[PDB]
Amino acid sequence: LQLFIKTLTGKTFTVEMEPSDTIENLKAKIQDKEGIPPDQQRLIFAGKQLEDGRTLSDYNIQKESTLHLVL
C-alpha cells in the first residue's frame, strides 16, 4: 500500500499502491508524482530489478517496503 521509493541522491518519497498493481503502473505513478518518465526508472527491491511483466505481489512487496529508484 504505502511504498518508500529512495533515490541515490538521498531523496525519499512515497507512493500508494495495491499488491495487484503492475510494475508499469507503479512507474506511471512515480512519473505522476516525480516527473520521471518510465523508461528512465529502474526499480530495485532486494537486489532485484522489477520487470513490467509482473505485479507488486510477485515480488513479495508489502506495506512500507522500500524500493530503490535508479535514474
From Swiss-Prot:
Cross-link (Glycyl lysine isopeptide (Lys-Gly) (interchain with G-Cter in ubiquitin)), chain numbering: K6, K11, K27, K29, K33, K48, K63
Subcellular location(s) of the protein: Cytoplasm; Nucleus
Domain of life: Eukaryota
PTM remark: Phosphorylated at Ser-65 by PINK1 during mitophagy. Phosphorylated ubiquitin specifically binds and activates parkin (PRKN), triggering mitophagy. Phosphorylation does not affect E1-mediated E2 charging of ubiquitin but affects discharging of E2 enzymes to form polyubiquitin chains. It also affects deubiquitination by deubiquitinase enzymes such as USP30.
Record site feature (Interacts with activating enzyme), residues: R54
Entry-annotated residues carrying Phosphoserine: S65
Site (Essential for function): H68
Consequence of changing K48R: No effect on HLTF-mediated polyubiquitination of PCNA
Residues bearing PTM (Microbial infection) ADP-ribosylthreonine: T66
Record-annotated Ubiquitin-like domain positions: 1-71
Functional note: Exists either covalently attached to another protein, or free (unanchored). When covalently bound, it is conjugated to target proteins via an isopeptide bond either as a monomer (monoubiquitin), a polymer linked via different Lys residues of the ubiquitin (polyubiquitin chains) or a linear polymer linked via the initiator Met of the ubiquitin (linear polyubiquitin chains).
Protein name: Ubiquitin
Originating organism: Homo sapiens (Human)
Included range, full protein: 1 to 71 of 128
